[PDB]
């Protein structure tokens, strides 16, 4: 099944953390990376000029169950994302979100697929459109149409 995973980093040098994250994603059992988007840049809010966020999208072919994939993305977030050495308040610096899993709609306490706010997040949809321009959501909405009809922040490449 093809799963689409969003990666975000605001950590240290986001290139290195994101690449470790990609390596870990490929190392998930019964799973392989099909393609990876370009890296995109999201400024922080406010003048503080804290680290920018690096955003990407990955297409992952997997024969895992959705909740099993979630175990792995959660694990990688702990192992690669700091959070032992600095958690709440940080926040955690590496985010791996399962955006879509096949044409599946999953509504469970642990896992909601499609990711609940993804259609309003340009830093999720634009990298997704780069690797899946013909994507259609389980409810039938076309990714190309959402990008024509919803307002998003400008999103430059990294
Ligand atoms: Cl949907
Ligand atoms: Mg997130
Ligand atoms: Mg998350």
Q: State the DSSP string of 68-101.
A: HHHHHHHHHHHHHS--SSS-TTS--SEEEEEEEE
Q: Which of 60, 7, 5, 58 is nearest to 30 (CA)?
A: 60
88 annotated active-site = no
**What DSSP character marks residue 47?**
S
Cis? peptide before 146, omega within 30° of 0:
no
In order of their start, the domains of the chain are 1-158 (3.30.70.560)
Active site residue: 27, 41, 52, 97, which one?
97
Residue 115 CA, distance from chain mean position = 9
- Does the annotation count 150 as an active-site position? no
Burial of 22 (0-12, 13-18, 19+ CB in 10 A): middle
Active site residue 52: no
How many angstroms is it from 2 CA to the middle of ligand 2?
Answer: 19
Nearest listed ligand to the Cα of residue 119: 1
Reported structure resolution in angstroms: 1.5
Experimental method: X-ray
The Å distance, Cα 145 to ligand 2 centre, comes to 23
CA distance 61 to 35: 10
Residue 52, helix vs strand vs coil: coil
Q: In angstroms, rounded to a whole number, what is the distance separating the alpha carbons of residues 158 and 53?
A: 9
- Rounded Cα gap, residues 58 and 32, in angstroms: 10
H or E segment and range at residue 109: none
């Amino acid at each position: 099944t093809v799963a689409y995973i969003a990666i975000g980093s605001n950590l240290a040098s986001p290139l290195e953390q994101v690449n470790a994250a990609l390596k870990a994603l490929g190392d998930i059992p019964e799973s392989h990376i099909l393609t990876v988007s370009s890296f995109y840049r999201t400024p922080p809010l406010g003048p503080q000029d804290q680290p920018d966020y690096l955003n990407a999208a990955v297409a992952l072919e997997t024969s895992l169950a959705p909740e099993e994939l979630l175990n792995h993305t959660q694990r990688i977030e702990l192992q690669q994302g700091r959070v032992r050495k600095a958690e709440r308040a940080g926040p955690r610096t590496l985010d791996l979100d399962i955006m879509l899993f096949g044409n599946e709609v999953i509504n469970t306490e642990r896992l909601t697929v499609p990711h609940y706010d993804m259609k309003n997040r340009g830093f999720m949809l634009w990298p997704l459109f780069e690797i899946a321009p013909e994507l259609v959501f389980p409810d039938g909405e076309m990714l190309r149409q959402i990008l024509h009809t919803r307002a998003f922040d400008k999103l430059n490449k990294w």
